[PDB]
Design a protein around this motif. Structure first.
Motif, PDB file in Angstrom:
ATOM      1  N   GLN A 278       0.872  -1.181   0.000  1.00 42.72           N
ATOM      2  CA  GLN A 278       0.000   0.000   0.000  1.00 42.72           C
ATOM      3  C   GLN A 278       0.906   1.228   0.000  1.00 42.72           C
ATOM      4  O   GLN A 278       1.800   1.349   0.845  1.00 42.72           O
ATOM      5  N   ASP A 318      -5.955  -3.514  -5.840  1.00 43.13           N
ATOM      6  CA  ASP A 318      -6.365  -3.014  -4.531  1.00 43.13           C
ATOM      7  C   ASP A 318      -6.068  -1.528  -4.402  1.00 43.13           C
ATOM      8  O   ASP A 318      -4.978  -1.059  -4.768  1.00 43.13           O
ATOM      9  N   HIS A 319      -7.004  -0.817  -3.786  1.00 43.84           N
ATOM     10  CA  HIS A 319      -6.933   0.625  -3.642  1.00 43.84           C
ATOM     11  C   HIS A 319      -8.167   1.105  -2.892  1.00 43.84           C
ATOM     12  O   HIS A 319      -9.167   0.392  -2.836  1.00 43.84           O
ATOM     13  N   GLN A 320      -8.069   2.275  -2.256  1.00 40.66           N
ATOM     14  CA  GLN A 320      -9.241   3.023  -1.774  1.00 40.66           C
ATOM     15  C   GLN A 320      -8.978   4.501  -2.021  1.00 40.66           C
ATOM     16  O   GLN A 320      -7.976   5.051  -1.568  1.00 40.66           O
ATOM     17  N   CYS A 380      -2.335  -0.490  -4.128  1.00 40.94           N
ATOM     18  CA  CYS A 380      -1.300  -1.516  -4.081  1.00 40.94           C
ATOM     19  C   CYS A 380      -0.477  -1.412  -5.367  1.00 40.94           C
ATOM     20  O   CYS A 380      -0.961  -1.739  -6.436  1.00 40.94           O
ATOM     21  N   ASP A 383       0.235  -4.623  -7.354  1.00 39.39           N
ATOM     22  CA  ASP A 383      -0.879  -5.144  -8.155  1.00 39.39           C
ATOM     23  C   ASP A 383      -1.023  -4.277  -9.373  1.00 39.39           C
ATOM     24  O   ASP A 383      -1.210  -4.786 -10.495  1.00 39.39           O
ATOM     25  N   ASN A 482      -5.846  -2.783   4.430  1.00 36.82           N
ATOM     26  CA  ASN A 482      -6.326  -3.344   3.172  1.00 36.82           C
ATOM     27  C   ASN A 482      -7.324  -4.489   3.503  1.00 36.82           C
ATOM     28  O   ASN A 482      -6.939  -5.505   4.066  1.00 36.82           O
ATOM     29  N   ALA A 484      -8.750  -6.654   1.964  1.00 29.45           N
ATOM     30  CA  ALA A 484      -8.334  -7.934   1.356  1.00 29.45           C
ATOM     31  C   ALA A 484      -7.266  -8.753   2.118  1.00 29.45           C
ATOM     32  O   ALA A 484      -7.139  -9.961   1.880  1.00 29.45           O
ATOM     33  N   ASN A 485      -6.406  -8.105   2.906  1.00 23.53           N
ATOM     34  CA  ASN A 485      -5.390  -8.853   3.659  1.00 23.53           C
ATOM     35  C   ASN A 485      -5.350  -8.576   5.154  1.00 23.53           C
ATOM     36  O   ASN A 485      -4.549  -9.178   5.846  1.00 23.53           O
TER      37      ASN A 485
END
Ligand SMILES: Cc1cc2nc3c(=O)[nH]c(=O)nc-3n(C[C@H](O)[C@H](O)[C@H](O)COP(=O)(O)OP(=O)(O)OC[C@H]3O[C@@H](n4cnc5c(N)ncnc54)[C@H](O)[C@@H]3O)c2cc1C
Ligand SMILES: [Cl-]
Length: 635
Positions: A278, A318-320, A380, A383, A482, A484-485
């Motif tokens: 990240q 992955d991101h926000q 990310c 990614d 994140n 996801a993790n």
């Protein structure tokens, strides 16, 4: 068929007045460049787009494939105003929607918007035409194929000689203009600028109007010392790299039909500095309105749009876009933030906020006030880089991994590439995007690029840490979980002259120390736990003026010999000496997620000899030879 919606008018005055659509078909290049004074609701642009799309349907094999449109708007409307006015032109609806989908904030400066799956580039220059034109870059000279001279009726502010002279300077020979007015002073203004001028009947009722053609190239005061040359061939490009910027540059070149090949020292892309889990994406502001801030203002917004376009096409990473909160945790940082807030930003870009307001957004007490960037966030980059590399591959880029370049040498119009030990390869044109390793070549070793290790810790979340909604920036940074993790990133060490990527325990503790040290007034940071000793290390390529380096790789020896005389001259002076067909992009520091997409697009546009999306000082401030040119320019 009426005249009342103004669509037929537009077509008559601006398209037909410049010989369109007939001219699409005879046009001898792959792209055609339009420029417009004003933009308004986009009526001229959308009408042109529509016609250019009909022409591409009908002649998929014609030379002309791309359109570039450059527009100068002093009073940029909001997207709702745009939507409201577009109700008048339902036949333009689908072009209009794509435009409104990407309409940018009212920030001074140039905003490049890529439309119609890369076939259209729209450069929107927000600012006063008159104060803007003398700031523009030599890459705009002799470029424009057709001008739409629009705006209020000659109100007179806009119609001066300075505009007409800039227009001719920017026009390609044979290029044209049309306008709706026939005022004598405008006619005389355009003649003295260098155009041939013809008066013709206006649309329907009122007016006469003017059209014209630039018979000869205006050789205009340049800045040869900061020349940005094209590649002679784009049908054979090799990129040396494998990080975020290699992938973006690949893609920006493929949009123009270049053929590109990747050589990457590692087994996989993103094993260098682009490999974190990240990273923070926000702009670097200073409130000084210098080249730095000007570049980052454009870069950030351009990057957000490209990342959104990619996500819209189905690319996954992955991101926000959760916002970034930069804290005044310090005397120095508070001073810096204070200076930024002296320029008046739309709150949609950057907003001053109290401790309370930040904490309300964050879900946790942020301990300080500071500045909030609501379109920033984290992504990310690992990614993202794998995803963009895959896309470049699907689109025609062949990839040779475990190809560490060891020797690069020009011989008989080709670059010969020797690896560590696979077959030697040779290519017409090379681009170096090797990050911290950039200055390891006889061709690059006089460039002031510094290498800086950092280590980013990977930490498990907790019920309290999960609450965090923003990236927090202090002397360091901490991302939200994140989801996801179930881990966050917290960094980062900053070790100058250090290129080892070994895990260090001292640096693992410091990533936590930084946080505890900068927010001592709150206790939740104690929940950060770095004791599993999970981290990633990498090496940044830093430049002391904090701006990337992108362009042709400059020739040191010849630069010093050729510009010993420069200061006296400032005459018709030769262009900056360079290694032939050799280009570079990098020097991204810690802000590559923000700066990479724009530098990539700058590099592709330059190599193709196209107009560039920034002003002269901002481009000169990105040029690889700049630190040298700066000395020589004063003695
Ligand atoms: C600790 C740390 C924290 C960071 N935090 C942030 C952040 O919060 N936000 C942000 O935006 N960015 C962050 N960054 C990233 C920063 O933006 C980097 O500058 C950027 O990722 C570098 O990208 P690049 O494509 O130019 O180079 P890199 O990702 O380093 O890639 C260079 C590539 O070139 C290849 N290569 C090198 N030499 C050769 C050779 N001789 N032959 C063939 N291939 C070669 C390598 O294989 C490598 O893949 C961080 C970086 C680090 C290290
Ligand atoms: Cl990162």
């Amino acid at each position: 068929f009426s005249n009342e919606d103004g669509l037929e008018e537009t077509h008559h005055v601006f398209l037909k007045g410049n010989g369109f659509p007939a001219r699409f078909a005879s046009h001898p290049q792959q792209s055609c460049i339009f420029a417009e004074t004003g933009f308004g609701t986009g009526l001229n642009f959308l009408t042109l787009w529509r016609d250019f799309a009909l022409f591409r349907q009908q002649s998929p094999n014609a030379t002309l494939r791309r359109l570039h449109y450059i527009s100068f708007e002093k009073y940029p409307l909001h997207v709702a105003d745009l939507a409201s006015a577009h109700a008048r032109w339902p036949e333009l609806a689908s072009f209009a929607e794509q435009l409104r989908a990407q309409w940018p904030l009212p920030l001074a400066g140039c905003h490049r918007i890529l439309l119609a799956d890369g076939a259209i580039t729209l450069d929107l220059w927000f600012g006063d035409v008159n104060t803007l034109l003398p700031t523009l870059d030599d890459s705009l000279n002799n470029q424009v194929d057709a001008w739409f001279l629009d705006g209020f009726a000659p109100n007179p502010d806009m119609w001066n000689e300075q505009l007409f002279n800039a227009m001719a300077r920017m026009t390609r020979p044979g290029g044209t203009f049309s306008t709706f007015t026939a005022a004598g002073f405008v006619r005389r203004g355009l003649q003295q600028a260098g155009f041939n001028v013809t008066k013709v009947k206006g649309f329907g009722q009122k007016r006469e109007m003017l059209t014209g053609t630039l018979p000869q190239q205006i050789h205009a005061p340049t800045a040869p010392w900061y020349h940005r040359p094209a590649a002679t061939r784009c049908d054979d490009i090799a990129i040396i790299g494998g990080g975020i910027v290699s992938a973006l540059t690949a893609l920006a070149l493929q949009r123009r039909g270049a053929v590109v090949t990747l050589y990457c020292a590692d087994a996989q892309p993103a094993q260098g500095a682009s490999g974190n889990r990240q990273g923070a994406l926000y702009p670097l502001l200073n409130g000084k309105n210098d080249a730095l801030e000007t570049f980052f203002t454009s870069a950030f917004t351009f990057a957000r749009r490209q990342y959104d376009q990619l996500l819209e096409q189905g690319i996954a990473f992955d991101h926000q876009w959760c916002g970034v909160s930069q804290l005044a945790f310090d005397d120095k940082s508070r001073g810096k933030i204070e200076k930024m807030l002296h320029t008046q930003w739309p709150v949609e870009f950057a907003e001053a906020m109290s401790r309370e307001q930040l904490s309300e957004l964050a879900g946790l007490d942020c301990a300080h006030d500071g500045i909030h960037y609501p379109a920033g966030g984290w992504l990310c980059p690992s990614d993202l880089t794998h995803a963009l590399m895959m896309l470049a591959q699907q689109n025609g880029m062949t990839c040779h991994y475990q190809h560490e370049l060891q020797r690069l040498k020009r011989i008989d119009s080709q670059w010969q590439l020797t690896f560590g030990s696979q077959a030697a390869k040779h290519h017409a044109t090379v681009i170096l995007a090797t990050g911290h390793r950039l200055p390891e070549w006889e061709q690059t070793h006089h460039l002031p690029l510094s290498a800086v290790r950092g280590q980013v810790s990977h930490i498990p979340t907790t019920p309290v840490l999960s609450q965090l909604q923003q990236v927090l920036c202090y002397d360091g940074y901490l991302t939200p979980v994140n989801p996801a993790n179930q881990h966050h990133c917290i960094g980062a060490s900053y070790q100058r002259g250090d290129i080892a990527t070994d895990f260090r325990l001292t640096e693992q503790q410091e990533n936590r120390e930084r946080l505890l040290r900068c927010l001592p007034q709150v206790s939740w940071p104690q929940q950060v736990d770095v004791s599993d000793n999970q981290a990633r290390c990498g090496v940044r390529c830093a430049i002391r003026d904090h701006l990337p380096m992108v362009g042709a790789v400059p020739d040191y020896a010849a630069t010093l010999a050729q510009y010993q005389d420069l200061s006296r001259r400032i005459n018709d002076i030769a262009v900056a000496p360079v290694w032939p067909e050799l280009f570079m992009v990098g020097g991204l520091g810690s802000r590559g997620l923000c700066s990479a997409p724009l530098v990539a697009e700058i590099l592709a546009a330059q190599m193709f000899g196209e107009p560039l999306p920034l002003d002269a000082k901002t481009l000169a401030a990105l040029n690889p030879n700049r630190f040298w040119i700066r000395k020589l320019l004063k003695g």
